[PDB]
Amino acid sequence: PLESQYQVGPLLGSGGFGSVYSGIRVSDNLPVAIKHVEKDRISDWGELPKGTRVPMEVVLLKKVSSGFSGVIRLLDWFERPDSFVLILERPEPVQDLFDFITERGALQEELARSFFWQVLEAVRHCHNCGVLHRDIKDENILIDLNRGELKLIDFGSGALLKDTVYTDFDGTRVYSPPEWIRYHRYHGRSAAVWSLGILLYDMVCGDIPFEHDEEIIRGQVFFRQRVSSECQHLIRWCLALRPSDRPTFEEIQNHPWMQDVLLPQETAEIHLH
Hints:
The chain has helices spanning 2-5, 56-64, 97-104, 109-128, 178-183, 188-205, 213-218, 229-238, 249-253, 264-272, and strands spanning 6-15, 18-25, 30-38, 45-47, 53-55, 74-79, 83-89, 94-96, 131-132, 141-144, 149-152, 159-160. It folds into 2 domains: 1-92, no CATH class; 93-273, no CATH class. It contains 10 helices and 12 strands.
């Protein structure tokens, strides 16, 4: 009974992730998000440790579920005759990075550093839990505006992290690496770093760098805003055409542009309040 434990509210959004309603947990007035996904639209299924057949998205959320606030926490799930319903946490007030960048344009480098750093911590957390997100982008990042903390959301394109090649992909094309566009092959970590270069460019320029396939494959980066040379170097490093020539998470977090990050609370007080 989801209807007794949770009180449903206004539709927050809908798309390739399903239909997400705002809601609240009656047991303690906690702001939740209620996500419905139709079974027939689910194309990837997995198994819980219990051995039961759920959508892959449920599997991945449980694997990454923890108190670490960098990744969205699945609080419960329910199976219905034609759909699954996921109860997720909902920060309040909240704004996703896409809307945030739309409203403000290109971000100051101090703020993009802090945001980018938190995204990297969140992605490292997923990989360390065996989860590959495969759809890192502004739309899938929530900003907890009180605390200055970012949250990675929507694992419905993800997969178990593996070391062998991936030959399928259902994420966002404009964030996908050149080896996927040309060969329909990629490896998890190098693909993720490519999409992080895309995201970081988006943060510091206010739009994504590539739109068409030919642009992704060419990989020429033009900066349309004033961006420091170290930040340009990190971005060009992440968007290297050869996957192996891309920097590891350790190399990104040790990069000179990534030094002296603001704490989340500092971030909120300086740039969000």
